[PDB]
Design an enzyme around this catalytic site. Structure first.
Site, PDB file in Angstrom:
ATOM      1  N   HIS A  61       0.823  -1.202   0.000  1.00 31.90           N
ATOM      2  CA  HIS A  61       0.000   0.000   0.000  1.00 31.90           C
ATOM      3  C   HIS A  61       0.857   1.252   0.000  1.00 31.90           C
ATOM      4  O   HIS A  61       0.548   2.212  -0.715  1.00 31.90           O
ATOM      5  CB  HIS A  61      -0.876   0.051   1.254  1.00 31.90           C
ATOM      6  CG  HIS A  61      -1.657  -1.196   1.499  1.00 31.90           C
ATOM      7  ND1 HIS A  61      -2.703  -1.589   0.693  1.00 31.90           N
ATOM      8  CD2 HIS A  61      -1.538  -2.146   2.456  1.00 31.90           C
ATOM      9  CE1 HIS A  61      -3.202  -2.724   1.145  1.00 31.90           C
ATOM     10  NE2 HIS A  61      -2.513  -3.084   2.213  1.00 31.90           N
ATOM     11  N   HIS A  93       2.017   9.201   1.306  1.00 30.96           N
ATOM     12  CA  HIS A  93       0.945   9.060   0.343  1.00 30.96           C
ATOM     13  C   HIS A  93       1.247  10.001  -0.809  1.00 30.96           C
ATOM     14  O   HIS A  93       1.646  11.148  -0.587  1.00 30.96           O
ATOM     15  CB  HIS A  93      -0.358   9.443   0.964  1.00 30.96           C
ATOM     16  CG  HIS A  93      -0.674   8.705   2.224  1.00 30.96           C
ATOM     17  ND1 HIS A  93      -1.526   7.625   2.245  1.00 30.96           N
ATOM     18  CD2 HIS A  93      -0.255   8.878   3.496  1.00 30.96           C
ATOM     19  CE1 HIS A  93      -1.642   7.183   3.483  1.00 30.96           C
ATOM     20  NE2 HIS A  93      -0.871   7.917   4.256  1.00 30.96           N
ATOM     21  N   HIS A 116       3.612  10.901   6.808  1.00 24.76           N
ATOM     22  CA  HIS A 116       3.001  10.571   8.090  1.00 24.76           C
ATOM     23  C   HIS A 116       4.054   9.926   8.977  1.00 24.76           C
ATOM     24  O   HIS A 116       4.572   8.855   8.650  1.00 24.76           O
ATOM     25  CB  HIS A 116       1.784   9.678   7.879  1.00 24.76           C
ATOM     26  CG  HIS A 116       0.639  10.413   7.260  1.00 24.76           C
ATOM     27  ND1 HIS A 116      -0.413   9.776   6.658  1.00 24.76           N
ATOM     28  CD2 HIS A 116       0.377  11.733   7.160  1.00 24.76           C
ATOM     29  CE1 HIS A 116      -1.266  10.657   6.186  1.00 24.76           C
ATOM     30  NE2 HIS A 116      -0.811  11.860   6.479  1.00 24.76           N
ATOM     31  N   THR A 196      -5.925   4.494   6.670  1.00 26.91           N
ATOM     32  CA  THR A 196      -6.028   3.229   5.972  1.00 26.91           C
ATOM     33  C   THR A 196      -6.808   2.258   6.864  1.00 26.91           C
ATOM     34  O   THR A 196      -6.803   2.386   8.108  1.00 26.91           O
ATOM     35  CB  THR A 196      -4.633   2.647   5.665  1.00 26.91           C
ATOM     36  OG1 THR A 196      -4.008   2.292   6.906  1.00 26.91           O
ATOM     37  CG2 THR A 196      -3.735   3.655   4.894  1.00 26.91           C
TER      38      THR A 196
HETATM   39 ZN   LIG Z   1      -0.597   7.621   6.420  1.00 23.48          ZN
END
Ligand SMILES: [Zn+2]
Length: 257
Positions: A61, A93, A116, A196
């Protein structure tokens, strides 16, 4: 089974994770005119001098840069936070194009990417217990825009070829996360969730106002990663961002006047 495609992406997540439609979901749009300066916020303290990175992992991911969190080494404190939050990992992301990729938005502005830095509250002992608490986690979010290269990011960019596909990891010691931070620590904060699955509503979000700049070449190397595993048809790791969710009954506070 979840991902970011048409058939398994953010608009589908609620069927296995009904909290997706919850009261405390992230990301959100930060309407700067509605956010209020909070003079009770204390100074934010980012203490990463003793950070110990271990490994980098493509999890299908994103990629996570993992840290040794067995000791109080890299910690976040102050600001809206009570007590001490320990860094466990960071990831990003990003978009297929420079005009999209961030999760939070600022007056509806999308940045090219978003970092993040994930921390867990030491009063709960470990990450797994922290994510059963409304104040279990603190995530420091940093926007990325495309412009000048970020020297502190290159070590990350250069190792991505070794972790191209889902499940691959590489040793990644001696990486200094201080080099990903902007000059200013001015921020917005609000209570939210993981962005997520499983989308748990455990996070105090701290989103820095000042983006960092990365080069077009740096982000282009992010976009060469794969969501798929080795030997499977190539599906580029791009647009691994959740869009803004309803703010509902929440207030965004600003650290700056
Ligand atoms: Zn994140």
């Amino acid at each position: 089974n979840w991902g970011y495609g048409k058939h398994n992406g953010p608009e589908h997540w609620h069927k296995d994770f009904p909290i997706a439609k919850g009261e405390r979901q992230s990301p959100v749009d930060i309407d700067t005119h509605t956010a209020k300066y909070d003079p009770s916020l204390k100074p934010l303290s980012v203490s990463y001098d003793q950070a110990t990175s271990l490994r980098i992992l493509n999890n299908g991911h994103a990629f996570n840069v993992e840290f040794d969190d067995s000791q109080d080494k890299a910690v976040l404190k102050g600001g809206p936070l009570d007590g001490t939050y320990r860094l466990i990992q960071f990831h990003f992301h990003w978009g297929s194009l420079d005009g999209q990729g961030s999760e939070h938005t600022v007056d509806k502005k999308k940045y090219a990417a978003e970092l993040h830095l994930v921390h867990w509250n030491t009063k709960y002992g470990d990450f797994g217990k922290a994510v059963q608490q409304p104040d279990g986690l603190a995530v420091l979010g940093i926007f990325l825009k495309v412009g000048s290269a970020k020297p502190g990011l290159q070590k990350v960019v250069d190792v991505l070829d070794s972790i191209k596909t889902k499940g691959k990891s590489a040793d990644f010691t001696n990486f200094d996360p201080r080099g990903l931070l902007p000059e200013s620590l001015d921020y917005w904060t609000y209570p939210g969730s993981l962005t997520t699955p499983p989308l748990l509503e455990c996070v105090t979000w701290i989103v820095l106002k000042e983006p960092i700049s990365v080069s077009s070449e740096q982000v282009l190397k992010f976009r060469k990663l794969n969501f798929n595993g080795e030997g499977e048809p190539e599906e580029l790791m791009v647009d691994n961002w959740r869009p803004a969710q309803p703010l509902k009954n929440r207030q965004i506070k600003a650290s700056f006047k």
